[PDB]
Amino acid sequence: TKHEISEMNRMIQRLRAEIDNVKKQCANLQNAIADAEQRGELALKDARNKLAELEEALQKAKQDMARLLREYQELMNTKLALDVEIATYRKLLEG
Amino acid sequence: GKSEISELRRTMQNLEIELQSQLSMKASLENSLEETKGRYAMQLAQIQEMIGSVEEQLAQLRCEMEQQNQEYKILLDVKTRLEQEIATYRRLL
């Protein structure tokens, strides 16, 4: 009969301790998420960076090729131009 | 006399609601974490994919740039022989 107040209190003690742990748990959680998004934003950052770095090298390369092609074309113009000197000079030989 | 056991149910049940509030918080936190870990893993995977695409394109171009300087060299080793060839014909006159 009197025994009732003795356990209601033992239990209230237990419940607080239980709540204290969910509180202690929810705190490590926020840190975890914080750490989650800190880690994250960085990876995306790094990623994005590598991407442009290459986008950059590509375009850079693209132009170099375009260049070597003009270089080759220009070399070819002269070679086919020597072809006709060889011709006008083979002619002069064999009449 | 009988009031003490009454105040205790009051405070007891009050705690039970604070528990419910804590569990609701915890559960809502768990959601947010997994969800965070997901959004970035996938956005990252998405960027990692864009990155690889460009790297391939780049690799290809350099292999082509390899063949195109090689081609130039050939052209040169010829244009030179020709220069030599006209040089000789001019030497005959």
Curated annotation (Swiss-Prot), chain A:
Site residues (Stutter), renumbered to this chain: Q38
Record's comment on post-translational modification: Phosphorylated by CDK1, AURKB and Rho-kinase, phosphorylation is regulated by the cell cycle. O-glycosylated.
Effect of E85D: In EBS2B; uncertain significance
Impact reported for R90H: In EBS2C; uncertain significance
Localization of this protein: Cytoplasm
Coil 2: annotated segments: 1-95
Impact upon substituting A57D: In EBS2C and EBS2B; uncertain significance
Tissues showing expression: Expressed in corneal epithelium (at protein level). Expressed in keratinocytes (at protein level).
Misc. comment: There are two types of cytoskeletal and microfibrillar keratin: I (acidic; 40-55 kDa) and II (neutral to basic; 56-70 kDa).
Medical condition linked: Epidermolysis bullosa simplex 2A, generalized severe: A form of epidermolysis bullosa simplex, a group of skin fragility disorders characterized by skin blistering due to cleavage within the basal layer of keratinocytes, and erosions caused by minor mechanical trauma. There is a broad spectrum of clinical severity ranging from minor blistering on the feet, to subtypes with extracutaneous involvement and a lethal outcome. Epidermolysis bullosa simplex 2B, generalized intermediate: A form of epidermolysis bullosa simplex, a group of skin fragility disorders characterized by skin blistering due to cleavage within the basal layer of keratinocytes, and erosions caused by minor mechanical trauma. There is a broad spectrum of clinical severity ranging from minor blistering on the feet, to subtypes with extracutaneous involvement and a lethal outcome. EBS2B is an autosomal dominant form characterized by generalized blistering manifesting at birth.
Subunit annotation: Heterodimer of a type I and a type II keratin. Heterodimer with type I keratin KRT25 leading to the formation of keratin intermediate filament (KIF) network. Forms a heterodimer (via 2B domains) with KRT14 (via 2B domains). Interacts with PLEC isoform 1C, when in a heterodimer with KRT14. Interacts with TCHP. Interacts with EPPK1. Interacts with AMELX. Interacts with PKP1 (via N-terminus) and PKP2.
Cited function: Required for the formation of keratin intermediate filaments in the basal epidermis and maintenance of the skin barrier in response to mechanical stress. Regulates the recruitment of Langerhans cells to the epidermis, potentially by modulation of the abundance of macrophage chemotactic cytokines, macrophage inflammatory cytokines and CTNND1 localization in keratinocytes.
Similarity field: Belongs to the intermediate filament family.
Protein name, per record: Keratin, type II cytoskeletal 5
Gene that specifies this protein: KRT5
Shown chain mapped onto the complete sequence: 382 to 476 of 590
From Swiss-Prot, chain B:
Family per similarity comment: Belongs to the intermediate filament family.
Residues the record marks as site: Stutter: G38
Record protein name field: Keratin, type I cytoskeletal 14
Summary of the function given for this chain in its UniProt record: The nonhelical tail domain is involved in promoting KRT5-KRT14 filaments to self-organize into large bundles and enhances the mechanical properties involved in resilience of keratin intermediate filaments in vitro.
Stretch of the intact protein here: 327 to 419 of 472
Segments of this protein annotated with the region Coil 2: 1-93
Tissue: Expressed in the corneal epithelium (at protein level). Detected in the basal layer, lowered within the more apically located layers specifically in the stratum spinosum, stratum granulosum but is not detected in stratum corneum. Strongly expressed in the outer root sheath of anagen follicles but not in the germinative matrix, inner root sheath or hair. Found in keratinocytes surrounding the club hair during telogen.
Disease: Epidermolysis bullosa simplex 1A, generalized severe: A form of epidermolysis bullosa simplex, a group of skin fragility disorders characterized by skin blistering due to cleavage within the basal layer of keratinocytes, and erosions caused by minor mechanical trauma. There is a broad spectrum of clinical severity ranging from minor blistering on the feet, to subtypes with extracutaneous involvement and a lethal outcome. EBS1A is an autosomal dominant form characterized by generalized intraepidermal skin blistering that begins and is very prominent at birth. Epidermolysis bullosa simplex 1C, localized: A form of epidermolysis bullosa simplex, a group of skin fragility disorders characterized by skin blistering due to cleavage within the basal layer of keratinocytes, and erosions caused by minor mechanical trauma. There is a broad spectrum of clinical severity ranging from minor blistering on the feet, to subtypes with extracutaneous involvement and a lethal outcome. EBS1C is an autosomal dominant form with intraepidermal blistering mainly restricted to hands and feet beginning in infancy. Nails may be thick and dystrophic.
Post-translational modification: A disulfide bond is formed between rather than within filaments and promotes the formation of a keratin filament cage around the nucleus. Ubiquitinated by the BCR(KLHL24) E3 ubiquitin ligase complex.
Listed result of changing Y40A: No effect on interaction with KRT5 or keratin intermediate filament networks
Subcellular compartments: Cytoplasm; Nucleus
Additional observations: There are two types of cytoskeletal and microfibrillar keratin: I (acidic; 40-55 kDa) and II (neutral to basic; 56-70 kDa).
Organism for this UniProt entry: Homo sapiens (Human)
